[PDB]
Structure formats: structure tokens, C-alpha cells
Design a protein around this ligand. Sequence first.
Ligand SMILES: Nc1ncnc2c1ncn2[C@@H]1O[C@H](COP(=O)(O)OP(=O)(O)NP(=O)(O)O)[C@@H](O)[C@H]1O
Ligand SMILES: Nc1ncnc2c1ncn2[C@@H]1O[C@H](COP(=O)(O)OP(=O)(O)NP(=O)(O)O)[C@@H](O)[C@H]1O
Ligand SMILES: Nc1ncnc2c1ncn2[C@@H]1O[C@H](COP(=O)(O)OP(=O)(O)NP(=O)(O)O)[C@@H](O)[C@H]1O
Ligand SMILES: Nc1ncnc2c1ncn2[C@@H]1O[C@H](COP(=O)(O)OP(=O)(O)NP(=O)(O)O)[C@@H](O)[C@H]1O
Ligand SMILES: Nc1ncnc2c1ncn2[C@@H]1O[C@H](COP(=O)(O)OP(=O)(O)NP(=O)(O)O)[C@@H](O)[C@H]1O
Ligand SMILES: [Mg+2]
Ligand SMILES: [Mg+2]
Ligand SMILES: [Mg+2]
Ligand SMILES: [Mg+2]
Ligand SMILES: [Mg+2]
Ligand SMILES: [Mg+2]
Lengths: 476, 469, 475
Amino acid sequence: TAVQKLPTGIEGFDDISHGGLPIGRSTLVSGTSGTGKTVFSMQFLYNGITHFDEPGVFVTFEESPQDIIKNAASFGWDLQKLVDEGKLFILDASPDPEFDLSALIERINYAIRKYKAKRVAIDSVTAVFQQYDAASVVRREIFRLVARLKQIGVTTVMTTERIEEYGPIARYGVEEFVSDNVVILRNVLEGERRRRTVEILKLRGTTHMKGEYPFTITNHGISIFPLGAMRLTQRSSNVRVSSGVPRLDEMCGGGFFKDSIILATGATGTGKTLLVSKFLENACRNKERAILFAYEESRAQLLRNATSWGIDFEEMERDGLLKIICAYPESTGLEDHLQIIKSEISEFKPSRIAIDSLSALARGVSNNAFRQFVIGVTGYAKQEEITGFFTNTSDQFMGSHSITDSHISTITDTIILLQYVEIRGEMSRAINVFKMRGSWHDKGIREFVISDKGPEIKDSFRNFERIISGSPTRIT
Amino acid sequence: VQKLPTGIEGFDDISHGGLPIGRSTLVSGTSGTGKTVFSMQFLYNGITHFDEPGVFVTFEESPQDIIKNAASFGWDLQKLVDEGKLFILDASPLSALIERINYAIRKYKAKRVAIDSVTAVFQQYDAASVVRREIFRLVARLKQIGVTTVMTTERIEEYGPIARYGVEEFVSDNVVILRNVLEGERRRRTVEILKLRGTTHMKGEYPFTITNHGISIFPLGAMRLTQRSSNVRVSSGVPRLDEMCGGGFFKDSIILATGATGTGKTLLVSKFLENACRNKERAILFAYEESRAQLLRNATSWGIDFEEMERDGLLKIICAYPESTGLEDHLQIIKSEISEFKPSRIAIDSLSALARGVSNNAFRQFVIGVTGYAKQEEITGFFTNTSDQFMGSHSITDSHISTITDTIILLQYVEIRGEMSRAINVFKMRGSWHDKGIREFVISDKGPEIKDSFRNFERIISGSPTRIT
Amino acid sequence: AVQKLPTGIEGFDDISHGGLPIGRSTLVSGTSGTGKTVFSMQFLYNGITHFDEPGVFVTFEESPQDIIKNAASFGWDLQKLVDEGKLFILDASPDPEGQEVNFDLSALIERINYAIRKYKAKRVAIDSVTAVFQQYDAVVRREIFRLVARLKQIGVTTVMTTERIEEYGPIARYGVEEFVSDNVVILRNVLEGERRRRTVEILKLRGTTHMKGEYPFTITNHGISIFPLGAMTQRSSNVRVSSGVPRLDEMCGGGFFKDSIILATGATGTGKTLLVSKFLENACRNKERAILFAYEESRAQLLRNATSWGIDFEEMERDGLLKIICAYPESTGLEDHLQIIKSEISEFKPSRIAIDSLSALARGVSNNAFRQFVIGVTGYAKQEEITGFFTNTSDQFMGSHSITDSHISTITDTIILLQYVEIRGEMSRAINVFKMRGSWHDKGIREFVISDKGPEIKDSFRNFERIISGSPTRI
Ligand SMILES: Nc1ncnc2c1ncn2[C@@H]1O[C@H](COP(=O)(O)OP(=O)(O)NP(=O)(O)O)[C@@H](O)[C@H]1O
Ligand SMILES: Nc1ncnc2c1ncn2[C@@H]1O[C@H](COP(=O)(O)OP(=O)(O)NP(=O)(O)O)[C@@H](O)[C@H]1O
Ligand SMILES: Nc1ncnc2c1ncn2[C@@H]1O[C@H](COP(=O)(O)OP(=O)(O)NP(=O)(O)O)[C@@H](O)[C@H]1O
Ligand SMILES: Nc1ncnc2c1ncn2[C@@H]1O[C@H](COP(=O)(O)OP(=O)(O)NP(=O)(O)O)[C@@H](O)[C@H]1O
Ligand SMILES: Nc1ncnc2c1ncn2[C@@H]1O[C@H](COP(=O)(O)OP(=O)(O)NP(=O)(O)O)[C@@H](O)[C@H]1O
Ligand SMILES: [Mg+2]
Ligand SMILES: [Mg+2]
Ligand SMILES: [Mg+2]
Ligand SMILES: [Mg+2]
Ligand SMILES: [Mg+2]
Ligand SMILES: [Mg+2]
């Protein structure tokens, strides 16, 4: 007879809550303005009706029912229908535009019975206390409301308000301790960018995932990405795919594995976009779909620079085997980027993917949040059986030294190292398969030349030393 | 939830269309952020562009002061007031006020309203509960009438509470935060849309500037990677370099010349703009290091006369110190001067100068800004960067500015036989073959003379090479 | 359109883009000892002495006698101006003995009004408005608005002094004054390390433009003097001057330029001060005035070390062609240092100048502050067409292992690079004209020897590699 839970239906919340929200109990969902308290509370009710056939009541202390309905239309929720079918009831407790909570408790109970409601949402409880002038019996009244609802036996969501993101959990510093369950929505301003996070602080009598988890409000409501939950569990096969460059495929011991993450690390101009461009060509030639995620160059530039290499991307676009998705890294946050990726993938249903580049997306953002992105993208592709080619521009121009994020290096199956080499007063370029995981790879640091045809991988600088430096020395 | 176009330059992009119609939007900020401007600009555009009358509720600032202050932006509000398009309700010493607004709304058939400042109307004793109940009224009543409102609120802190009483945010359907952050000894204006209930919006802060045209927002995010790209070449002025670039620079490209002090970046800039005026192409030089006088002289020593170019009306030398203004302003200056002169080529000497006393993320927003604006307007951009190490040549514009540039010319010193020789190298050239040689070049009265490469040397990049065998 | 009134305070009219809006009230807030009372007195004083605009100064504490007395330090005979009826100080100080009581400012309004007309005052100053409430209770917003409006009707440009508790905190005390005032100026005395820095910021000028951010100022005998770097043209000529060393002149294509900023960079004891000494010796040899600004060595030592190089500074000090201004960097702030330099240049009217060294002035200061110093000094020298030889000591001993770590390279026109070089188990020296804008320069890392006669630049190290490292190798 332990605390059983009720599915919310919100992508990720049931995972981080190890089931859902405790049944017959109230959950405080606190946050600042614009965190997604109302969306969460509505989505809890909406998913109740549509998925589980559980009617719900929505208590509003300010926002008009008509306004609540119009705001949900963005998500594609016809709340007018649910209202017209007695599946949703919006109790208007908003003041007229022209003391102890007890009457309202009666009105709610009447409604719950009338519409046979199993879920309730109250938004916001902090309002009535201010709207009137309590700020003195907050604990008493919140305790009453919680207790009376426990009697009715309804799963409740209570919206609270905060001022500071990493400050007190609520306004009166009392609502948290009365509530059985506490969830915190945050919208943290880092640099000049916001990040939405959800935390389940407390679930009395049950287990939950601790810490903040990133989420996004899309046209499908709140979508949490259980970064921690996503488990290391894939398929992995010895099936190979080609790079579009034959000598490289020989250097990779037949070609890239289908279930793989490929990284091309090198200085600027080393020729990473060409490797990417050839990898997508190969897909479209083998009658496979692919998506290019550009974060550095426009389509026009990509198309031009490709046609110089002799790769017609438009023909692939027209054929329906290629989709170039161009966007500035600061066009949104890494959280939304990953969603746009995941969404675009689901639509086109690609076999191969390419992000150009990762170093561009790591502009300004913390090394932590970037790690979360990489793992998120890496994991999605390996789970969805999509081969992934990633690019990374090294800051050091000469040779190679290391990788910015140690996470990337260990999260990639294959590492292609492009570098520059000074040979007889000329800037040569060299390619090397540094890592393959599960195959033989050529252990050579081979010269290559970029031409109108593309990459021409030549032989190793055998008669040179200190090639990794970028400034070698010929040894007779 | 449909939206009304504000007409504010960049806001309708950040807000994904504009402000929701019929609803009220809270615009909070400290003094001098630009709340009254936004509110005036909102109404102004309402009537001049969309033929929507507006009512402006003032609580302290006199009607005539509002008209006097607006004149700076070039807004004849009195003309509009006379023509019965704008009404300024003077509430300077809520049911009563609301009744007066409703009357004014109908009297002028107004579709937009601006209330500034609401915090002042509660500046008696009204506290928390009173403010929440009272604001709720105003917002609700305004919603009933059928008018799109902009409501001004005050802050005491830039990254603290959004308003005063910590109540106005939760009541309002829409929240916009205006900030003026003192970063060191320079202020930076920024707009953030925190909340737009019922629809989507661009999140995060975005920089803006109050100009003689009012609030002008330049979103780095809304900037789409959707510029054009051609195979049309343009010359550097140095023919050996054009041959090294496989015909020349591209018309649709950003050029970077990186190197130590005295390596000759400004010479390459001089010859670049010389070629432009030689082909009757208009060009601007945004100089942040030297002065017009010293540039003219040092160019004349190179056999380059900027004075004639300027007289012809093809060259514009804009000199300014990086510390004179913030990077947000500098960008507005660059954009503005470009829009007037309509140049085909542009030059910034140097980017490294503008980086002095600024964050990497701010300088990134700047570079990303200018780069993009040049590419979208089809303007060739020769940028310069001075490396701090004068021989090591370890990195180039070490701030991820390389991924933004299409061409990289690396200038360096080379220690040959106890002499300090120079070298030029086309490091990168997207979409073209480039000479892979680290060619020696010598500056003269005539200019840069690119010679042959150091074949019989090693460790050239180090700056201290070794003669082989 | 909002017209502005020239304050007369040095720099304020530049940062205010004209001055203070006419017929409008300006708030000038700051902590204790920021110069709020100075600014206000200076506003009125200048008003009278420059534009024949009478003024009225309202005090709620300090007696007229004291205000007149304190102003004497700036050389302002306010009693003269009071006697002529050009200035009036309305004493509204609390009665020595009395009792207390809502508060209304209707009484003072009419007292100020009366005096305004009586003295025909164009300018007015209130100091400090905070005190008048800090003597009873806080109505502030309403009472502030009342005064601003009444004074607006009268059409007098007013300065309202207000007091703060923290430097980077609330603009005023009660969190209201700011919003009610049309114009806001924040004076700050920021404590960094253990040194104070005075800064002016115009936060807001309704209906007008202004320079944003903080700008440094100093309070002297002249009063408040603000130094906007953004306000700053420098002309250029192909006229050569000599370094004092004939070989270096050759290496610099026939000498330094008259319109140039020379920088000498190197490790300690590489010989920057010798080149400085020779540079100045030439000016005096060509009957030209020069000033040496030293921040490392005393006058006595400089002279001793100079005479050991065969340079008599005393004769040129006596002949009135040389002024040696010695002072520690920590004696003042860079804001002050710069004003000492500008002032000393204005007096002597030199043709050449020298700072020995810039590296010393950078000690224990903000990188931003030191930048603003160099941009200022270098700008003023180029402005007045004064040739400037600056010194910089690199912390790295051997060779030019790294460059100048201060981002000065872009300002300096000529860069002389002194370095050490180990040759056959012995520390040698070297000179190189690294940069020379507008001239050919010898591109050679020439050996150079110091002696009793002074510098002897010699031949290059042609038979050596890795010279710049400081540890070469014989080919
Ligand atoms: N269709 C949509 N797509 C993307 N984002 C959306 C969409 N609809 C709403 N949003 C976002 O969700 C916000 C509304 O969240 P909401 O749940 O109303 O916040 P809240 O925390 O309840 N606000 P408050 O009542 O002031 O405390 C909007 O301001 C947008 O940022
Ligand atoms: N048509 C061409 N012929 C020969 N070489 C070319 C051609 N186009 C490009 N290149 C070479 O390839 C480089 C650009 O390759 P690219 O794949 O864009 O590299 P990258 O590492 O992705 N560059 P970046 O994004 O700026 O860091 C140029 O600098 C040239 O060296
Ligand atoms: N008349 C001339 N004859 C020969 N060389 C000259 C002449 N004028 C200038 N130079 C050379 O040009 C160099 C300066 O070139 P410039 O274009 O100013 O380089 P830069 O790297 O842009 N300098 P900076 O802005 O100080 O970092 C000098 O160091 C000289 O070697
Ligand atoms: N013509 C103009 N050109 C440029 N900037 C201007 C112009 N007019 C006003 N400004 C700027 O805008 C500021 C005034 O903006 P405004 O909207 O009146 O401030 P506010 O934030 O409403 N002040 P407050 O009511 O006290 O909280 C001035 O201080 C200037 O910085
Ligand atoms: N009579 C002399 N004969 C030879 N060499 C001398 C003589 N007097 C001084 N020197 C040299 O000159 C050096 C000091 O030169 P100076 O111009 O003071 O250099 P600096 O770089 O300015 N030194 P510092 O201020 O400590 O960083 C000494 O270390 C000696 O090597
Ligand atoms: Mg809400
Ligand atoms: Mg690339
Ligand atoms: Mg205002
Ligand atoms: Mg230059
Ligand atoms: Mg005082
Ligand atoms: Mg010395």
C-alpha cells in the first residue's frame, strides 16, 4: 500500500517522477513568470481527458476561462470541445473587475462531483492570498485546501509564484512544507540566453529523479528531455556505410559503421565541410535520406562551395534525399536546437545526419550545457539508427594538440584528424583516422589535396618527423 | 492569439509578429531604459502606418513635455493631436481613471493605448495586495473595452525583480524587460520578452539602441543564415595576391587579414579600397587605430592617395576610438553609414581594437552582426586583426571569428640571417583554389611585392626558421 | 526640441552633448565626497562669470558662510557675487532649537520663487533634497514632483543634489527621485584595491542625446574636470627628428617622425632609458624644450646615470630646455597623473616628451584604466604635435619571447625592440626597429653595446638562428 502514481502524459515528466504524480495527492508547481506553470497544469488535465478519459477541473483566480482557451489553441488543444463535452470545467474564481478559503473548497467539491473529476488544477494559489489580503494564514489555508482535496481523493496541481530562480521555492516560504510534492519550473538567464529547467524537489512516500532537467515549450506543450534517464542501450552492428571518399573508406577498414558517431576535428579550412558534403552525397546516391544541419554557412554558400567540389545538393533536394537546415547558433538555445533536430528527423526520417559544426553551437554556452547537447544528439541517433557525422574546428591552427571538450572525444566512435603541415614553405594538409572503435583503421598520417573533384588522399609523410607539430623536419 | 505590428525595428521579429491584440503588455525597466519611447513609438506607428488612433495616459510627465521630448525622434505628435488621432490623457496630480480612458478610447475610436507610469499611480500607500487587485482591474477593463495596451513599470535593479512589488508580472498577460546594464564603465541596452501568454516569442536578451529614429533592435538570432553567394571575383589591389587567391577575393565574402603589428594589414586594406575607387566602387573605411591624417600620409608613402578618392566621392574614412561608444552603438554606426553611402566594399581596421575592453560573447555578437549585414547587403568586407604574439603565430583571431570568415590572409615575421623578413600566406579561401605557399613579401614606396616561398627553410611558422641541411 | 545650457564644467558639455536641458531639473546623486556640492556651485559660478546668468543656491544644512568659504579653495569669491546680487544663498537650515510637526514643500517653493524673480536667476541649485525629508519623514515622490513642476513653470534650469549609500546600487535613497526627475547624473567615488576613482555618468537626458557610461573626473583648484576619451584629429607630417643616436636614425629611415609615438620595449636593463636620454639630449641640442616624466628613478639617479653615459641633464635643466618631473605611480591615480602631464605640458610648451615608464604606471591598476591613460597621453601628444618616446619593460628576461602585454602596439607608431642574446656564454644586447609607420626601416636585429659615450649599434647576427628566443644557435 505504497504511494501509487498517475501518468501526467508530459514527455519526460513520468520518467523523472518514476511513474508520474502521486495519486490522490497535491503537487506544488512553483516558478517565476513565463516558466510554464499554466501550460503544465493544463497539459496535466488535457492529457488526462484525451489519453486516460479522466475529467478535470481548472480553478482560475485571475485569467478568464475564455482567455485560458485561446492561449491553449497554440498547442492545438480544443478546450472548448472538452468543455462542451463536460470533460473539462473551468471554475472562474477571478475577482470582478468592477476571510479563509472555504466557500471555494465547496465549489470545487461540487464541481468535482458534477463532472466526475479525477484531476484538478489550481492556478494560482498565491493570487487569492494577495488578491484578498491574507499573507498571514497562508499555511493554514493551503493546508485546508490540500486536506479537503485529499478527502475528495483527487490528484491536484497547485501553481505557486516565485521572484528568484535559485532563491526561495515559493513566495511566503511556507507553501513547500505543507505540500506533499514540490516541482520547480525555472527559466534561468545565462549570459543573455534563457534555459527552461524542471526539478522534482520532493515526492513524499516515493522515489524520483533528483536535479534539474532541461525542457522546452513547443506547439505540443512541455517536452522534458530526460538526459539522465536516457539509458546506454543501443543495437550496434558491423554493417558499414561509405564516406563518399573511397580511400578514406579503405582507411576506415571498409567504411564507417552504420551505428556510429563520426567526428572530423581540424583547424579552419582543413576540409571538414567537404568530408560532410561527400558523406551526404553518398547517402543520396545509395538512395538514402539525409539532413544537413548547418550553423556556419548559408544554403547559397554551401551550394556554391559544393558545386566547386562537384556536388549538386539541389538535385538531391529535388530528388527528396537531402534537407539542408540552416540556422545561426544564437537563433535559439541548445535545448531548442536539439528539439528542432529531433523534430526535423522524425518528419524526414533520415538514415544519415550531419551537424556543421559542434564548435559553432558551443559559442558562449557553458561546457556543461554543451555536454548535455552532444550526449542528447549522440544518444538520439544511435537509438534511432541514424549515422552521424559531426564537425569541430580546433582553435590551434597548426597541427593538432587536443580537444576542447573531453566529452566529445569519448562520445565519438570514429575520429578523423585533419591538420596542416608546413612542407618546403607550403601549407600542406594531412588526414588521419585517429580512432574507429571496432575496426582496423589506417594508422597513417596521409597527405591530401583538395581539388575541383574533391579530396585526393595521397601517401604518408614517411620521410618526415614531428608532423603532429605542424612544422616537421625531413630526416635523410 | 493574433498580434499587432508595433513597427519597432526588430521587435516584431523578436515577438514573432508583434504584441497580442486586445491584451496588455507590461514594459518594465530602470530609468533611462526607454520605456516612454517604446510606448510613444508603439502609438506613433499605430497612426502613421496602420491608421490606428492611440491614447497616452500620463501620470507625471506633462503632455507638452511628451511632445517636446518626442520631437527629437522627428514625431509631430501635436499635428496628430490636432487632427484628433492622438489623445494624451493627463492623470498628473482606478475606476474613475478607467472610466476616463474608456471615454477617450471611444471619443477617438482608439485601438492602441499607452499607460505610463502605473507604478506612480500606486505611489501613495497601495501595497502588494492593492497593486495586484488594481492592476488586475486595469488590465481586465482594458481587455473588455477591446484595446491593445502597453503598460510601463519601474525597477530598482537590472538583474533583480522584474517590477517593484513583485506582483505586476504575474497579473500581466505579456511581459517585456528593458535593461541598461553598466558593464564596467559602459552601458548596454537590451530587450527581453519574458512572457507572451498564448503564443511564441524569441527568448533571451537582445541588444537595442535609442537613435534619432527611436528604439532600434538588431536581433542576432532572427538574423537568418540565408545570404546569397556568387562566383564573382573582386581584386585585392595586389595582383600576385589575386593570383594566390585563384583570381581574387569573392564579391560575396568576408576577408580576414591576421598578423602581428607592422606586418602590413593596413597596407592590404589600403590597396583593397584603392582597387575599389579605381573601379568607381564606393567604399568605407571604419578605422579604430589611426587617424585620417596619418592614414593619408602613410598611404602616400605607399603610393596611394585617399584624398582624391574621397573627393571623387568613392571613399569614406570614418575614424573613432573603440572606447568612445559601446559595440552595440558601433554596429548601428556601421549599418547607418552603409545605408547612406551605399558602399560595395567595406573595411574595419581593426577588429582587435574593438575587442579591447569587451566580452568575447559581445564581440562575437558584433562580428556576427557586421559579417551578416555585409553578406546580406552584398558588401565585401576586409577585416583586420592584430595578434598579440609577434612571431609565435600560434592562433588567428583567437575567438572563433575564423569560422565566420571566408578568406584568411596570414601575415607573419620570419627571422632570416639576423634580419626580420615578412611573409604572406592565403590560409583559407572557401570555394577557390588558393596558393598554399608561405611567400616572402617586401613593402616599399610602391607597396607590397610578393616574392617566392621559403623552400630551403623549416619551422617557418615558428617565426624562427632553420635552413635545411 | 530640447535645448541645453553650457555648464562650463570641463568635459560635461561633451558627455551631455551640449549641456543640461534648459527649463528642466537635473538630479545629481552620489555618495559622500563625490563632488555634488562642487558641481552645483560650479554650475552657478560659471553661469554668472561666463554667461551673466544669476543663480540661487538652496541649502538645508551648511551655512552660506561655509559654502562661500569652501568655494575659496577653487578661487571663487562668492561673497563678491553675493554682494553684487549676482548670487543668493537661501538658507533653509533647521532652526538650532525647535520641534518637529504630512510634509509640504509649498513654503520653500515660494521662497525660491521669490528669490528667483528677485535676483532674476536663470540657474538654481538644491542641495541636498534628501536632507529635507531626512529631517522629518518620507511624500518624497509628490513633493519632488511639486518642486520640479513649479521650477519648470518658472523656467529655471535646476540642479537637485541627492545622496546615495552604495556606489553601484540604488541611484538615490528612496527609489523615486530618479523616475520623477527628467535628467539623472550619477557621481561615483569607487574604491578599487585601496585607491578611489571619481567617475561621472549621465544616466538619462529625456528628449535628448548624451554619452552613455562612466567617465573619469578629478576635483582640483579649477573644480570638477571630466576627461571623455570619446570626445577626442591628430595631424601627421613627414618631418623627421633625431633619436640622439645617428645609427638608429638611419635604421628609422632618417630619424623618428616629429608627429609620432615611439615605443621602446625590452627586458630590464636592455637600455630603454639610454635611448630616452639621447632622445631628449637631441631636443636640447637643437634648442628645443623637453619634459621627462619619470616613475621609476629619482632626478639624482637619472642625472648620475646620464652623466655616466656622457649626458649632462643639469646644463639643459639650467638652460631651460629640460624639465625632469619625478614621481611614484602610486602617489596618485592615472586620472590625476594625466592631468599633471597635460598641465606641465601647457606650462613649458615642449617639443618632445617622454614617459619612463608606462610599465610602471600599469602597476596595480585596471587594464581598462591604463588603456584610457595611454589613449589620452598619446592622443594629447599627437594633438599638440609633440613627439613622444615611451618606455615599456617586459617581465620576460630573455629575448622577445612574447610581445607587449597591454595592447599598446596599435597606438605606438614606431616600436624599438631591445632584447638580450646569449652569445658564447655571454649576455649580449640587440636593437631592432620592429615597426615604423610611414618609412622604410632596417629590418635587422643589430648588436648594440652600451659604453661611457652611450649606445653603439653594430652589425647583425647573420651567422645565428633563433635570435628572438634569446638563446641562438650558430649556423
Ligand atoms: N505554442 C507555443 N510555442 C512555444 N512557446 C509557447 C507556446 N505557447 C506558450 N509558450 C510559452 O509559454 C509561456 C506561457 O507559459 P505560462 O504557463 O503561461 O507561464 P506562467 O509560469 O503560468 N506565467 P505567470 O502566470 O505569469 O506566472 C509563453 O510566454 C511562451 O514563452
Ligand atoms: N574549388 C576548390 N578547389 C580547391 N581547393 C578548394 C576548393 N574549394 C575549397 N578548397 C579548399 O578547401 C578549403 C575549405 O574547405 P572546407 O570544407 O570549407 O573546410 P572547413 O574546415 O569546413 N572550413 P571552416 O568551416 O571555415 O572551418 C579552402 O580553404 C581551400 O583550401
Ligand atoms: N615608405 C615605406 N617604405 C617601406 N616600408 C614601409 C613604408 N611605410 C611603411 N612601411 C612598412 O609598413 C609597416 C607598417 O604597415 P601597416 O600596414 O601599418 O601594418 P599593420 O600590421 O597594419 N600595423 P599596426 O596597425 O601598427 O599593427 C612598417 O613597419 C614598415 O615596415
Ligand atoms: N532623440 C534621441 N536619440 C537618442 N537617444 C534618445 C533620444 N531621446 C531620448 N533618448 C534616450 O532615451 C532616454 C529616455 O528614454 P525614456 O523612455 O524617456 O526613459 P524612461 O526609461 O521612460 N525613464 P523613466 O520614466 O524615468 O523611468 C534618454 O535618457 C536617452 O538615453
Ligand atoms: N658606464 C656604463 N658602461 C657600460 N654599460 C653601462 C654603463 N652604465 C650603464 N650601462 C648599461 O646600461 C644598463 C641600464 O640601461 P637603462 O637605459 O637603464 O635600461 P632600462 O631598460 O631602462 N633598465 P630598467 O629601467 O631597470 O628596466 C645597465 O644594466 C648596463 O648594462
Ligand atoms: Mg500563467
Ligand atoms: Mg566549415
Ligand atoms: Mg518616463
Ligand atoms: Mg594597421
Ligand atoms: Mg554637500
Ligand atoms: Mg629604465
